Design a protein around this ligand. Sequence first.
Ligand SMILES: CC(=O)N[C@H]1[C@H](O[C@@H]2[C@H](O[C@]3(C(=O)O)C[C@H](O)[C@@H](NC(C)=O)[C@H]([C@H](O)[C@H](O)CO)O3)[C@@H](O)[C@H](O[C@H]3[C@H](O)[C@@H](O)[C@H](O)O[C@@H]3CO)O[C@@H]2CO)O[C@H](CO)[C@H](O)[C@@H]1O[C@@H]1O[C@H](CO)[C@H](O)[C@H](O)[C@H]1O
Ligand SMILES: CC(=O)N[C@H]1[C@H](O[C@@H]2[C@H](O[C@]3(C(=O)O)C[C@H](O)[C@@H](NC(C)=O)[C@H]([C@H](O)[C@H](O)CO)O3)[C@@H](O)[C@H](O[C@H]3[C@H](O)[C@@H](O)[C@H](O)O[C@@H]3CO)O[C@@H]2CO)O[C@H](CO)[C@H](O)[C@@H]1O[C@@H]1O[C@H](CO)[C@H](O)[C@H](O)[C@H]1O
Ligand SMILES: [Cl-]
Lengths: 103, 103, 103, 103, 103
Amino acid sequence: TPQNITDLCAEYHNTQIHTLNDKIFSYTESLARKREMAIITFKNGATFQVEVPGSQHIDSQKKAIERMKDTLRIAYLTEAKVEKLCVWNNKTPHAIAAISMAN
Amino acid sequence: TPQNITDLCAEYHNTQIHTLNDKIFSYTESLARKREMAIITFKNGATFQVEVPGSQHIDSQKKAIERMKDTLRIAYLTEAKVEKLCVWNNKTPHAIAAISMAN
Amino acid sequence: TPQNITDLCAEYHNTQIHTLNDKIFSYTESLARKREMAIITFKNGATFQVEVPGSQHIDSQKKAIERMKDTLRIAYLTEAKVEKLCVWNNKTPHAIAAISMAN
Amino acid sequence: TPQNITDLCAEYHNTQIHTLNDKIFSYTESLARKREMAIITFKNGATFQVEVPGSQHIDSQKKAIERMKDTLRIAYLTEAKVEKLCVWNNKTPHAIAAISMAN
Amino acid sequence: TPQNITDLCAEYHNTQIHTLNDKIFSYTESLARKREMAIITFKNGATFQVEVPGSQHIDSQKKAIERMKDTLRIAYLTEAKVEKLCVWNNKTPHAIAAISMAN
Ligand SMILES: CC(=O)N[C@H]1[C@H](O[C@@H]2[C@H](O[C@]3(C(=O)O)C[C@H](O)[C@@H](NC(C)=O)[C@H]([C@H](O)[C@H](O)CO)O3)[C@@H](O)[C@H](O[C@H]3[C@H](O)[C@@H](O)[C@H](O)O[C@@H]3CO)O[C@@H]2CO)O[C@H](CO)[C@H](O)[C@@H]1O[C@@H]1O[C@H](CO)[C@H](O)[C@H](O)[C@H]1O
Ligand SMILES: CC(=O)N[C@H]1[C@H](O[C@@H]2[C@H](O[C@]3(C(=O)O)C[C@H](O)[C@@H](NC(C)=O)[C@H]([C@H](O)[C@H](O)CO)O3)[C@@H](O)[C@H](O[C@H]3[C@H](O)[C@@H](O)[C@H](O)O[C@@H]3CO)O[C@@H]2CO)O[C@H](CO)[C@H](O)[C@@H]1O[C@@H]1O[C@H](CO)[C@H](O)[C@H](O)[C@H]1O
Ligand SMILES: [Cl-]
């Protein structure tokens, strides 16, 4: 089993690690139909998304999706420093697959 | 897929962006029959609501609505500054569709 | 659709507004059978309850009962000032229908 | 309907009030099979548990049990002062039936 | 029945206690398929995981698994001190079974 975000990220196709070492700059949440998702940017301008759940996700992923949204929300509110992001780069904005936070 | 709230709002009918750049002034919550909802106001008098889930709403929108309510409560509690709100102006108060918070 | 708590409270039978403008003094919670409920009081001795969900309530009522409880707990914990409460006066202690918070 | 924890506790068999007026000393949580439970202690050594959900518990019970766990966790983390506990004294450690918190 | 994490940990095969008395150093969360899990680290390098639900778990443990993730998440964000962890040492990284926190 992967021991860290890096090795975990390397297990899938079209992924890439982004090292931020910075807190989240803005948080956006949408309840609009077909656009039920969350978006975040950082000071440098990088923008990321938590994908609207769809056909490319199995049941275990749907719940993990809801948890990831809870997570970003509280991290943003408490101004926590996000270290790294493992994202799928074949989408725009890049879709978040994993996150790590280190004080 | 939109990169921001403005473009996202631009994807629906009867929507509209509101720049507040201010923390929520009042938060109201009701559990009364058929009026299970939340209402927020800003110091300028601006008043918005999170629509009572309805027949039209599907499961995805339903839990999105639940999350928004959670979002408004904690944001109000943390005095988090809200930047913009994308609302459906064909209702009174205007219903919230999306929200953005900055730093 | 109503825009504030006083106007909302006025749409039902046997309700009333209690103006508090003060934080909750104590929070009580129970998991005992038939009394799975929460109770709060204010320094002035005022006491209120969130009804135990019954047969009368539909699931949308039920979910709202759940949220109110969450709301009260976190309100108590953050020491937020509660402004007004819309309550059913046909019960004892008076049962909560809606709540508003503002500073 | 009871208005305080003492009166509510008095409605059952084999219960008892414990007055603590102190914050939680430690919090323990387990996911191990048949031990999916929470245990809390106070500085004076006192120890209490939230029973593992079982067959006797109706939806309202199990759900109330899940809530009690969220409550104790957050009470612990925020260092909230626990006033009294209503517990079943025919179980070791004594099992929590209700809780009250005051400043 | 068991009063502490040590005794509880003792009821299973392949377990072991780790006394840490320190705060979580990094927190990692993933929503990738078959990797819907969490991983934590402590300053000395020690790594632990919450296992992806599997056939070795029942619905009761599945709930508890979601709860443990929420727990690790707030503990981290709040820099709470974890005292001990009961883990399964037949896996890599070590799988968390129970956790104790004390100021
Ligand atoms: C790259 C891709 O299209 N992935 C989609 C996936 O397709 C399957 C194979 O991809 C992997 C992968 O993503 O790397 C292979 C991994 O080892 C799998 N790992 C595990 C632990 O299961 C994952 C995993 O199944 C998915 O990520 C879960 O959603 O899938 C893909 O390579 C394969 O297609 C080959 C084909 O076999 C070969 O003959 C041909 O020559 O080349 C193809 C491309 O390499 O086909 C597999 C399906 O039959 O399928 C899932 C849905 O079932 C998704 O569509 C996944 O796409 C990504 O989904 C992400 C969410 O999980 C996210 O939205 C990304 O943005 C999507 O591209
Ligand atoms: C050690 C093990 O194999 N555990 C798996 C379990 O197997 C059962 C027996 O082990 C216990 C244990 O873990 O100590 C026995 C406990 O008394 C049980 N306690 C309670 C309250 O129920 C637990 C419990 O069932 C599991 O932890 C739940 O997942 O299981 C194991 O000894 C046994 O096989 C014996 C056999 O009976 C004996 O004749 C033979 O000669 O020696 C064998 C090995 O000592 O069989 C039991 C199952 O038939 O079964 C469950 C599935 O039901 C899991 O697969 C469990 O594996 C662990 O699961 C953990 C998560 O809960 C975690 O992932 C660990 O990493 C897994 O190893
Ligand atoms: Cl009884």
